[PDB]
Design a protein around this motif. Sequence first.
Motif, short mmCIF file in Angstrom:
data_model
loop_
_atom_site.label_atom_id
_atom_site.label_comp_id
_atom_site.label_asym_id
_atom_site.label_seq_id
_atom_site.Cartn_x
_atom_site.Cartn_y
_atom_site.Cartn_z
N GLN B 14 0.81 -1.19 0.00
CA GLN B 14 0.00 0.00 0.00
C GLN B 14 0.84 1.25 0.00
O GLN B 14 2.06 1.22 0.25
N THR B 15 0.16 2.35 -0.30
CA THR B 15 0.81 3.66 -0.40
C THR B 15 1.11 4.30 0.96
O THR B 15 1.91 5.23 1.01
N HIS B 16 0.51 3.82 2.06
CA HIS B 16 0.77 4.45 3.38
C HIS B 16 1.56 3.63 4.44
O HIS B 16 1.98 2.50 4.16
N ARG B 17 1.75 4.22 5.64
CA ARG B 17 2.64 3.72 6.74
C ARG B 17 3.43 2.41 6.50
O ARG B 17 4.64 2.48 6.27
N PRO B 18 2.77 1.23 6.60
CA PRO B 18 3.46 0.02 6.15
C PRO B 18 3.47 -0.03 4.63
O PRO B 18 2.45 -0.35 4.03
N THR B 19 4.61 0.29 4.03
CA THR B 19 4.75 0.40 2.58
C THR B 19 4.37 -0.89 1.92
O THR B 19 4.19 -0.93 0.71
N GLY B 20 4.26 -1.93 2.73
CA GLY B 20 3.79 -3.24 2.30
C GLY B 20 4.66 -4.36 2.84
O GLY B 20 5.84 -4.16 3.10
N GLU B 21 4.09 -5.56 2.99
CA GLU B 21 4.82 -6.71 3.54
C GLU B 21 4.51 -8.01 2.77
O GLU B 21 3.62 -8.07 1.92
N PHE B 22 5.27 -9.04 3.11
CA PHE B 22 5.24 -10.28 2.40
C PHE B 22 5.53 -11.34 3.42
O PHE B 22 6.56 -11.25 4.09
N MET B 23 4.67 -12.35 3.54
CA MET B 23 4.87 -13.39 4.53
C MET B 23 4.24 -14.71 4.18
O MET B 23 3.63 -14.90 3.13
#
Lengths: 198, 181
Positions: B14-23
């Motif tokens: 996403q465009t905000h705070r957590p730019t993104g994750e992978f798990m």
Amino acid sequence: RKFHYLPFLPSTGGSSPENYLFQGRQECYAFNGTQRFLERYIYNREEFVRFDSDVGEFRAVTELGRPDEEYWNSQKDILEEERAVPDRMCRHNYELGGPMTLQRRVQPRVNVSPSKKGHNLLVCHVTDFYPGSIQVRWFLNGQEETAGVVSTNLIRNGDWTFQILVMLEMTPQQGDVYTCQVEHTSLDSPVTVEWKAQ
Amino acid sequence: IKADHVSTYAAFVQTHRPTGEFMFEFDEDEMFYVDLDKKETVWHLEEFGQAFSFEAQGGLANIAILNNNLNTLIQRSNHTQATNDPPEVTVFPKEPVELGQPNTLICHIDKFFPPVLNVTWLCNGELVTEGVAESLFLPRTDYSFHKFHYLTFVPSAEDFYDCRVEHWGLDQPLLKHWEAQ
Ligand SMILES: *[C@@H]1O[C@H](CO)[C@@H](O)[C@H](O)[C@H]1NC(C)=O
Ligand SMILES: *[C@@H]1O[C@H](CO)[C@@H](O)[C@H](O)[C@H]1NC(C)=O
Ligand SMILES: *[C@H]1O[C@H](CO)[C@@H](O)[C@H](O)[C@H]1NC(C)=O
């Protein structure tokens, strides 16, 4: 000896303030040595396209993912590699992960406490177990107890341990031996603990 | 979906705070993820990592791929944004609570969207520093999210805790209270 993965597919058309999310899941489902694969793509809560091994091709869950379906399904190399996954990626990880995942066993700790005056309850507090499949049973002086019992829902600690509370209805007599009993894939002999009131 | 066990790579961008994750996930518990700053695979349980490795680059790659895809779909949707779903929040111990006996408080935040949060603990008013840990923004079946905030403490006789939580789906920062009997 390492976990395999799968590159995602590029979407079609590449060539509080604002916020957009895009999610992709690649889910493996294991049944009787069988393995079924599911690759879904979500924009902002709305799953738009998806692949199901059992279908053999993609489906546009919302019109929003129509462009991907048409492209992807007229692409023989893509399709053939999706279809492979149940056996490539899924199998590999399922088999690799086994000992730490499927064979994971954690002994629960059991605990029995009052909580009364001012109704009357006896919580059997069962903490710290994996997997979540557990049986918990009450006994008054040896004999089972159905009525007056409340099981909380199974509660996931989210550190690969579960927790559960099973309280009983109380009427303490004199020489009462109240036993909580647990059973789990870890401990073969069913662990129990009890309580008196004197 | 008629299955015995479920293993899924879930990753969002996403465009905000957590730019993104992978798990990775195995039956709703999270196995390993890839720390995007540190560019390394991080294993939830110590024994996992000592059992098998996983290529950190692979997740990095997919994260880049999804960054891309985000933009495509930013297009074919005239930039549509879902509205913010408030969190259902409960707080409960890890072990049975007892008189001055080492324990852990769990703050489970559920059913929210998008995954942008500020979460802090308050102990008798005071913001806690030491003792705090936390899960990733975990993805749900229903494309909502949930998180765990962990605090370690000793059950004091008279002593309270509030789990302070900010999210756009609110406007009252919600705190669930917690104590012993
Ligand atoms: C999306 O684009 C179309 C162009 O034909 C336009 O009618 C519409 O106003 C746009 N939607 C929004 C929400 O701005
Ligand atoms: C998190 O904290 C910062 C403090 O500056 C604030 O600006 C932001 O709006 C907060 N985010 C949420 C989701 O509450
Ligand atoms: C899995 O075992 C079931 C019995 O529950 C049986 O019907 C079948 O032989 C097995 N599955 C397949 C796909 O062959």
